[model samples]
Target chain A: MKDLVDTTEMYLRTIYELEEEGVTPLRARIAERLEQSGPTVSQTVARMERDGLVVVASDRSLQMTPTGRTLATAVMRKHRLAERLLTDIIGLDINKVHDEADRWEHVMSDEVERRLVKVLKDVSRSPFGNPIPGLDELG
Target chain B: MKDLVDTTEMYLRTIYELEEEGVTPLRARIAERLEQSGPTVSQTVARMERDGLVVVASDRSLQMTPTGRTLATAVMRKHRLAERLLTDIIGLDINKVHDEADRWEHVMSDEVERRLVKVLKDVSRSPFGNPIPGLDELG
Candidate 1:
């Protein structure tokens, strides 16, 4: 809804989450995981900082600002919803839903996220057992 | 959380809502009314048809097939949750919260939607007076 989210940015957040639990992440680390080059990560980091979604450290580390986290969380939220929707609704192979959700996490909108939260009441984790938290900033 | 009820397809349901109301929506209508669209919507509809979400009729009429309607009604449940979140938790502008909820509707996951609904229990009209039918279609 904010119109600030895009495919590239969503992928950036996924990278952030992969590294969110770790210490500062380097561009090379990100490039390795995302299958991109260091240069690509650098360009994306510059854009993310320009959008206030992230802050890059002098050490080339990446972290989500509150603004960035909100968008990232939304992406995470959408992925979780897809997992539930696919497994619980369509009876798909739960194991593969993660990859499917990974593709969707970037493209889903706020409208779908709301629906997901509603229909799947009482769910706390993805089918893959990933935690889906509340509005961390709001709380 | 039965992921069936929650998804980006919620935006499609909203589009279906506008169509049912006989409002000819514009591109901005898709963007302003629904937070995430353009590629997301286009891709979703194509896949949804393959997955039975909706069918695109002749003359570009977006038809919510049975599957799409089921998902849409589920999203309506979340729309109300958003109203509650906006009104009680966030204390956002009551008059404007509906629009805000409209924007936020697709962002939250099933886990958060449950809590938001419980906390905002016994409210009416999505903070904008949009009725919340327990078991009704958007039409």
Candidate 2:
């Protein structure tokens, strides 16, 4: 297997998702979304801050750095694409696709991600945010 | 996604795969296969031993404890099953299944594993590369 994914990426994805929804990411929100505890989120977000993946704005909202935004976008794209592959091709139940793809996105390599699009030839119809929930990002 | 499949599980899977291929699992071989450093493998195997997931025999071979065996089997099952989905359904290249599923195995949940198998409903399988073993040995 490829090296285990860095935990930071999950945090980055959450921050982007919240931002996409027009909500600013705060440590509390990340904790709630990830079901992680306050101290844990604080420590993690602090680490991200140190790493330059994020910068806490004056309003206490978390904002992604360029590197962070790019990684988050890629992960989000992989996530949605996996959902499509699971539902459209694997015949996995639509209800379950989101949960399944939640795990898939982290592990999928760029090559596999590209292959899904290349082979499906159907992803031009991107489903950026159609309605897959239960994103207990780490759960 | 599911708490980032424990890194320990990856080690267990590697050890189990080595054993299944008729080779005794030793730290050196694990180091070679994983391309991890000798000290790293030694430390991890020591931790697994302390955790009761593995035992080092007088023969200098490694053996899985029940907990380790169960987890290793489950991971291998997930790995092989994922290969099947990627290859059979997603149209991932046959040559790529091994590398792809190597990551998939770590992240796949039990429900997704069952669902993937059910999708085939009449089957016996894997992009298995080799036949799945522990599953047969048990049920």
Candidate 3:
């Protein structure tokens, strides 16, 4: 359960990209992005489906369940906040906010998560211009 | 190593209490708070000391080295930031945030940590008034 948060976030990002591309993610693409093999991706998707975190469509495309979508939004929010914190605020060496945010996005508690969203004056995208939704509702 | 940050944090907190309370934290006390004991704690501490993450003081007072201190401060900041983020802005259940933050504090990264801090307006204390020094410099 504790480890699921990170996994969920990764799945969410994959789903987000699939939706953005207007194509559902297939096992091959998922494996490519994750740098894993087809069988591993298949196993993971099966587990996610079993947990109600994702759905396999008739075309074998993957869609997020509502539960998955909600968690994905949460991960997206955290990633954006982390970007703002790292590049804009912390003055990290690289524009590495995305990478840094990648780690924290999954681990931070929901409460702490909300407070971070509140501190942002305004935001439409992450530092990288990826659309960030459901931020205000964190409060 | 990158994977052991959580264990290191627990060790810092345990050692911090031990030194502050004028007691040498043996493997037992760390195990008690961390809910493990014996070889796990001993083995961990040895590794930390070897990496110069901590120092076994002249009097066997478990003291973190400079590197350890920095890491510990980061962990502490994360803990406090999460606490503030949850209770102050998000309207989460107060009692729940502490335990929640405790679990997530270890796995988050420096970028996400900075973001959580900035979002919380660089708090100097947790919701429960635990000291969270150096968060102001995060932004």
Candidate 4:
């Protein structure tokens, strides 16, 4: 598995959702979703493909390989749990938790992740009611 | 003021603390503190100097300009408060909050900062007991 930087994890997670939503994962779409420049998206996508985290199809759609999916799942799992911690425990507004969780997801360590899983009362979903990935396996 | 990237903010904030501690800010010290390569530190310090956020003195010591100090104070304020949020309110371990707050210091918006200020009970210090910049004025 490639050492996934925050940026790489972001791209993979975005692509995961795009695939989930049946949207074509074009570089431009990723750029638009991420609010990044087209060139930046293209460069990162190329790097991710080279790193075996992504596969670009003949039609130019982006797909996360199994490695990429697992990484993305882990990120998403942490993000939703972080959001839950922020909103439920810290009393941050639900609307605000998503952006805060975005920052937390990249920085939280495995030890902290384990602690959160143990401390949180409910881990099925995020503050915004989005499902927390990988929770069932942890259960 | 230049829109500081996270790396730039990290450098400026480190310089701010080093100056407070009476440590002569050097590129080597900064590289060591940030765990970045010597060449990378040299290049970024040059860019910071060019951007007018920093100055290189006759002794080859680094100094933050007034602009840089202001930016650093703001970043440090956000960072410490974010740490407080993680440790005090969310009950994250103090050891883990610092690294998480580092990522949060860059992404937290002014509105979120305002909300956190109102929500958090005494923003005088971080979880690790470092004084939060500008909190005395708030008090």
Candidate 5:
């Protein structure tokens, strides 16, 4: 069973990561990445298509729509920002931040994300060294 | 239906809060607080009872079990700690932190909570002045 966290955001975030890694956004691969059922991923992707968040190509690869990309990047941005807060401020270990950030990523509003940028003193990268997307955009 | 967050934790936390306020925990009241239907609350509480998280008495008041109280206090601890971190460290307004902390509450693990206690320098009180539960029990 899937976690009780945001399924839609998780799917979008997963697809974004796969695309970042130069992997095709195929449903099967996404299912593998998320440890979800293929049927579940397909069903959710079908809904995401209707919501204009993602598109299913003829070859069955998935791609983010403009809205989807914006949303996905925002989530990615929040995840990294939360990680930075957890690490640099909270004294949590770098390797331990990801799982906690995954949940924080979904709940952070634009306001919190913007304020975090200031408190983090405009740190641009995660402790893990990924350039956090949407930092400038959020601020 | 409920939010995608942890339904069980939410219920336990709600009941815990109601008890703290000396309000009896009833299905209807919980539904009102959570924006869930009576039937939905009933169904979920039934499951919680089976899981030993809560018990609904003949008087229709629900009480958390020992295990449930421990879990609920841990969540409460996390929420308050997260709020303090957001407000004191992340520069988010205290008023704006509840929603964010609600999400962070569910995601924060015991390890992170213990570490936060250290970084917050044993600040036992939340920004809102709630004595964060489980700080001593945790660290």
Candidate 6:
């Protein structure tokens, strides 16, 4: 995930969330979620597949490869942790936490994530009640 | 500021900071601070000038136009407010607040900023001890 940009990370995270919701990952849905244009989404998704981060099935569904899942979970974990910190500690409105966390997730380093986990000491779910992916499980 | 993107906002903020420090806002320094390549910085800076957000002096020094300063101050204010919320309210490590706030600055909405100010009840300075642009002052 070293060279993975925030845009790609967002795409992967969106795909992961869709998969979790039992939604078939399609290009159009991904575009809709990110509010990106169809052609832009298609171009980026094709690039992701080329980078070995995703697989396009015969039915045109998108799926994350193991490598992609690893990156997604890591990004998701950071996101949830930031949400928890913002809501539980910073007194940010729960409703606003998701948008704030979206940016924080891409900026935090591994060291900061570890520090956040230690400080919060609680990480079962996000403030929005979404499960925080376990690092070991993702690995 | 409505149409300004994150990358452009970052450039403006960097220029603002350099100017605040009384340093010349040269392209090289902006590139170093943002960890972006020279051409990328140059291209973005040119775009910003074309957008009327900045002025390139005869000596090739960068300066934010009045329009640019207004936008830059607002974004910087948001950045500092988030930093204050993170460090003062959430108890995030003081050292880590700057990086975290850097990302939070872009994603927050006007509504969220107003709410954050109300929740925190103060926004005189950042966790890093830099001044937060007062909302009234900016207006």
Best by DockQ: 5
Report the candidate with higher lDDT, 5 versus 6: 5
Looking at model 2, give its docking quality level.
acceptable
Off by over 4 Å in 2: A1-6, A93-95, A119-139, B1-6, B121-125, B134-139
lDDT of 3 by residue, B49-130 (tens): 9889887766655778888877776666777786776676556678788776776577655665665655666477778866
Candidate rank order under DockQ: 5, 2, 3, 4, 6, 1
| Order of quality (lDDT) | 5, 6, 4, 2, 3, 1
Interface RMSD values for the candidates, listed in order? 12.7, 4.8, 6.7, 7.5, 2.8, 7.0
Query: Which one wins by lDDT: 4 or 6?
Result: 6
Say which candidate scores most in lDDT: 5
What lDDT score belongs to each candidate, Candidate 1 first?
0.60, 0.74, 0.69, 0.78, 0.83, 0.79
Name the weakest run of 10 consecutive residues (lDDT summed) in model 2 chain A. Answer: A130-139
DockQ of each: 0.05, 0.44, 0.26, 0.22, 0.54, 0.21
**lDDT for each residue of candidate 2 in B1-139, tens digit (9 for 90 to 100):** 3332556887888988798788889888988887778878888888888989989998768999999898888888878877777777667778888887877787776666666666754236565446664455333
CAPRI-style docking class of model 5 based on DockQ: medium
Question: Considering only N, C-alpha and C atoms within 3 Å, which residue pairs clash in candidate 5?
Answer: none
For candidate 2, write residues A1-139 as lDDT tens digits.
3332546777887887898788879888988888778888888888988878889888878888988777787777778878877767666667778767766778787777767766664564434445433222322
Best by TM-score: 5
Per-residue alpha-carbon lDDT of model 5 for B1-139, expressed as tens digits?
Answer: 1253678888888888888789898888889998888888889999998989988899988988999899999888998888887877667877778877877787778888888777775467888777877777885
Give lDDT for model 3: 0.69
- Chain A TM-score compared with the true chain A, each model in order: 0.79, 0.83, 0.85, 0.88, 0.94, 0.90
RMSD for each of the candidates: 10.0, 5.3, 5.6, 4.5, 2.0, 4.6
**What is the number of backbone collisions in each predicted candidate, taken in the order shown?**
15, 0, 2, 0, 0, 0
Candidates by TM-score, descending order: 5, 2, 4, 6, 3, 1
Candidate 1 global TM-score: 0.47
